[PDB]
Enzyme design. Sequence first.
Site, PDB file in Angstrom:
ATOM      1  N   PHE A 142      50.274   7.190  90.378  1.00 38.69           N
ATOM      2  CA  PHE A 142      50.966   7.413  89.117  1.00 38.69           C
ATOM      3  C   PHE A 142      51.306   8.894  88.977  1.00 38.69           C
ATOM      4  CE2 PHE A 142      50.850   3.429  86.622  1.00 38.69           C
ATOM      5  CZ  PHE A 142      50.099   2.637  87.482  1.00 38.69           C
ATOM      6  N   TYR A 152      52.738  15.587  86.221  1.00 39.03           N
ATOM      7  CA  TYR A 152      52.014  15.185  87.430  1.00 39.03           C
ATOM      8  C   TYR A 152      52.917  14.908  88.633  1.00 39.03           C
ATOM      9  CZ  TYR A 152      47.411  14.972  85.136  1.00 39.03           C
ATOM     10  OH  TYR A 152      46.231  15.290  84.500  1.00 39.03           O
ATOM     11  N   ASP A 174      46.836  13.741  92.041  1.00 40.44           N
ATOM     12  CA  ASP A 174      46.462  15.156  92.138  1.00 40.44           C
ATOM     13  C   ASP A 174      45.401  15.375  93.226  1.00 40.44           C
ATOM     14  OD1 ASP A 174      44.685  13.733  90.470  1.00 40.44           O
ATOM     15  OD2 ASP A 174      44.019  15.565  89.467  1.00 40.44           O
ATOM     16  N   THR A 234      26.688   8.339  84.055  1.00 38.25           N
ATOM     17  CA  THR A 234      27.445   8.376  82.806  1.00 38.25           C
ATOM     18  C   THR A 234      28.160   7.051  82.502  1.00 38.25           C
ATOM     19  OG1 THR A 234      29.369   9.380  83.909  1.00 38.25           O
ATOM     20  CG2 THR A 234      27.763  10.886  82.889  1.00 38.25           C
ATOM     21  N   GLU A 252      37.491   4.217  83.917  1.00 36.54           N
ATOM     22  CA  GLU A 252      36.346   4.377  84.833  1.00 36.54           C
ATOM     23  C   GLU A 252      35.060   3.716  84.313  1.00 36.54           C
ATOM     24  OE1 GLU A 252      35.486   8.024  87.388  1.00 36.54           O
ATOM     25  OE2 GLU A 252      33.957   8.306  85.834  1.00 36.54           O
ATOM     26  N   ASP A 289      35.102  17.090  96.142  1.00 34.41           N
ATOM     27  CA  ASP A 289      35.554  18.262  95.410  1.00 34.41           C
ATOM     28  C   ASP A 289      34.743  19.448  95.931  1.00 34.41           C
ATOM     29  OD1 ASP A 289      36.100  20.295  93.556  1.00 34.41           O
ATOM     30  OD2 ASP A 289      36.061  18.948  91.833  1.00 34.41           O
TER      31      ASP A 289
HETATM   32  O1  LIG Z   1      50.248  12.541  82.274  1.00 33.81           O
HETATM   33  C1  LIG Z   1      49.709  11.918  83.183  1.00 33.81           C
HETATM   34  C2  LIG Z   1      48.344  11.654  83.152  1.00 33.81           C
HETATM   35  C3  LIG Z   1      47.747  11.162  84.310  1.00 33.81           C
HETATM   36  N1  LIG Z   1      48.508  10.502  85.241  1.00 33.81           N
HETATM   37  C4  LIG Z   1      47.837   9.741  86.335  1.00 33.81           C
HETATM   38  O2  LIG Z   1      46.510   9.377  85.971  1.00 33.81           O
HETATM   39  C5  LIG Z   1      45.567   9.885  86.908  1.00 33.81           C
HETATM   40  C6  LIG Z   1      44.245  10.268  86.242  1.00 33.81           C
HETATM   41  O3  LIG Z   1      44.381  11.425  85.439  1.00 33.81           O
HETATM   42  P1  LIG Z   1      43.537  12.759  85.770  1.00 33.81           P
HETATM   43  O4  LIG Z   1      43.716  13.134  87.192  1.00 33.81           O
HETATM   44  O5  LIG Z   1      43.958  13.851  84.855  1.00 33.81           O
HETATM   45  O6  LIG Z   1      41.998  12.362  85.495  1.00 33.81           O
HETATM   46  P2  LIG Z   1      40.764  13.158  86.171  1.00 33.81           P
HETATM   47  O7  LIG Z   1      40.097  12.288  87.165  1.00 33.81           O
HETATM   48  O8  LIG Z   1      41.235  14.406  86.821  1.00 33.81           O
HETATM   49  O9  LIG Z   1      39.791  13.514  85.112  1.00 33.81           O
HETATM   50  C7  LIG Z   1      46.271  11.045  87.598  1.00 33.81           C
HETATM   51  O10 LIG Z   1      45.838  11.215  88.925  1.00 33.81           O
HETATM   52  C8  LIG Z   1      47.714  10.607  87.583  1.00 33.81           C
HETATM   53  O11 LIG Z   1      47.980   9.841  88.739  1.00 33.81           O
HETATM   54  C9  LIG Z   1      49.876  10.767  85.276  1.00 33.81           C
HETATM   55  O12 LIG Z   1      50.593  10.393  86.206  1.00 33.81           O
HETATM   56  N2  LIG Z   1      50.466  11.477  84.247  1.00 33.81           N
HETATM   57 MN   LIG Z   2      42.532  12.915  89.278  1.00 39.00          MN
END
Ligand SMILES: O=c1ccn([C@@H]2O[C@H](COP(=O)(O)OP(=O)(O)O)[C@@H](O)[C@H]2O)c(=O)[nH]1
Ligand SMILES: [Mn+2]
EC number: 2.4.1.40
Lengths: 276, 277
Positions: free
Chosen positions: B60, B65, B145, B177, B235, B258
Site C-alpha cells: 500500500f 508513502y 516503507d 503488547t 496488528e 530494524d
Molecule cells: O498514509 C498512509 C499510511 C500508511 N500506508 C500503508 O500502511 C502501512 C503501515 O503504516 P506504517 O508503516 O506507518 O506503520 P508502522 O509499522 O511503521 O508503525 C505502510 O507501510 C503503508 O504501506 C500508506 O500507504 N499510506
Molecule cells: Mn511500516
Amino acid sequence: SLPRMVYPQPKVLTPCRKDVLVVTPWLAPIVWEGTFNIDILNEQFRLQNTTIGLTVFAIKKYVAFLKLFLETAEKHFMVGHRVHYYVFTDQLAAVPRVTLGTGRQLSVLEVWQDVSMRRMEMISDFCERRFLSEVDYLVCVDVDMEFRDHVGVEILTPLFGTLHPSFYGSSREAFTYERRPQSQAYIPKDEGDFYYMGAFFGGSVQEVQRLTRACHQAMMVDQANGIEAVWHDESHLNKYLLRHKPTKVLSPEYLWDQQLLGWPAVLRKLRFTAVP
Amino acid sequence: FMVSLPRMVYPQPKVLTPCRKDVLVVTPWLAPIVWEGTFNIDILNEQFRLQNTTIGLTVFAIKKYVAFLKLFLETAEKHFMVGHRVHYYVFTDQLAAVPRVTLGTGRQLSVLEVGASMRRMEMISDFCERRFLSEVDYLVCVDVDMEFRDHVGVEILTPLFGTLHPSFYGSSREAFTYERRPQSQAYIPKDEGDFYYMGAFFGGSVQEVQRLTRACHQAMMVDQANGIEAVWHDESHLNKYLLRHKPTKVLSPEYLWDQQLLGWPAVLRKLRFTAVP
Ligand SMILES: O=c1ccn([C@@H]2O[C@H](COP(=O)(O)OP(=O)(O)O)[C@@H](O)[C@H]2O)c(=O)[nH]1
Ligand SMILES: [Mn+2]
C-alpha cells in the site's frame, strides 16, 4: 478456531532438542519426544472430528500376534480420537475378541511374487474400495509388534515415513537401497536422505493410495524386466520417498527392537517395539 | 501439492546433528520456525518450479508513502522470489507516481486504483475475489516503507504464515503488547499467547489470506460499533487471529528487522527485509 488454552509459553531462544535433528532440509518436522505439546495437537484434531484408519496383515501363523497388538493399541494408539482398525486375514475365526473403547471399531477383510506385491496392491485397491469413504488418515504397520507408550496425532500429516532403527545414524553410501540401474527402485550412492523402514508409514488416504499404487506399478515393471529388488517393497518405498518428500518423518522412538539395540539415552521413550 | 522431483545432488542430512543449537526451529504444534540453516533452497525451488507457482506481493502506497516505492521494487527485483513468477500489486491513490522500473522475465506489475485504519484488511479481502484468486497461487502482504537486503524465497510459502516482531522474540508473554481490555475482539489475557507477530509481514495461500483479512476486518467493525479502537489496530486483530488459528510456518526476525533500533545480534545470520531509516 481453538478455544482458550492453558500451557507453557514456547521460548524462541530455548531449543527443544539439542542432541538431534528436528526438521528436514525440506522443512518437514522430525518427531521426537519434547518437540510437541500433545494437548494443543489433540484439540486441533478433535475440532475436525478426525478418524484414523489402522491397517495390519495377520495371515497364517501371524494371527497369533493380534491379541497383544490390539490390547496394547487400545492403551496407547490415538486414545481420545476415533479409530478404525482394518485386519487383512485368511482366518476370520482366529481374530481375538477384544473390548474396544468409544469411537473405535474393527473391520475384518477376508483375503512368492504374489506375496511380495500383496501389501502394496491390497492397500491401494482398498483405498478406492473403502478407505476414501471411511477414514481421513491411513496408518500402515506390521502386526508382530506391541505398543508400550504414546503414539498419537503428532504423527498425522499428508505423508510420512519412519526411520529404520538400525540405520538412523548411518551415512547414505551404507544404506541398503537397491543399487542395480536395471531396477526401478535404483538409488545411486550420491543420492538419498534417510533409510525408511517398510514396517511403519502413512498419510492422507489420497497420498497413501498414490504411494502404494506407485510402488506396485514399479514392482510390476521390475518383474517384466526380469529383476527383483533387494529388500522388495521396502526398496521401492525408499525410491518413492526420495522423489516425493514426506511432510513428517518419525524418529526410531516409533519403531524399535530392544533385544537388538537396548535402550540408548537418545531415545527418551520406547513407543512401538518389535515382539521377539 | 505433492510434486515428483528429479535426480538431485546435495549433502546428506544427519539425524544426530542438531539443526541450530541456539534457536527453537519448530513450534509446539510442529510448524517450522524459518531460520537460516533450516532449509536447502535448491530442493525447495525445484518443488515450487514443478508447480509453476505464481506469487502475489501487495504493498500500500497512499499519499506520501508513494516515495517508498522505487527502493522497494528495485530491491525486490534483486531479492524477492528470484527465479519464480511474481505479480506485484500496488494499491495507490497516484497511478502516475509509480516509478518506471525494469522487471525480469515472468514478472509483472498492476496498479490497483483506490481512494485515499480498516483499509488494508478490507481491500486485500475485496481484491482476492476481483483479481487474486484467478491470477496467483500465494499472497504475500507487506509494508512499503521497507527494503530487501537478502534472500526472501519459497521457503516462506505454506498455507498460513506469520512473522516474529523483532522487539519481542525474546520476551515473555506478559510483556507482549496484545490488546488487554476484555471489551475488545482482539483481547488476549496475560496467561495466553505463543508469540507476538508483526502486522508488516504476513501471507499464505489466497484462500487462507482471504479468510484472515476478512475475519480481521469484521472483527474491527464490531469494535467500531462498541466505540473502541485496539491498541495496535490491525496488528492487534492479527495476533488474536493467529493465536486461535495456528500458522503453518513462523518466520524468524531475519524476515523483519530494524538495525537502527536493535543492532545485529549473533543469532541473526542474515538480515533479509529491513526498515527504512
Ligand atoms: O498514509 C498512509 C499510511 C500508511 N500506508 C500503508 O500502511 C502501512 C503501515 O503504516 P506504517 O508503516 O506507518 O506503520 P508502522 O509499522 O511503521 O508503525 C505502510 O507501510 C503503508 O504501506 C500508506 O500507504 N499510506
Ligand atoms: Mn511500516
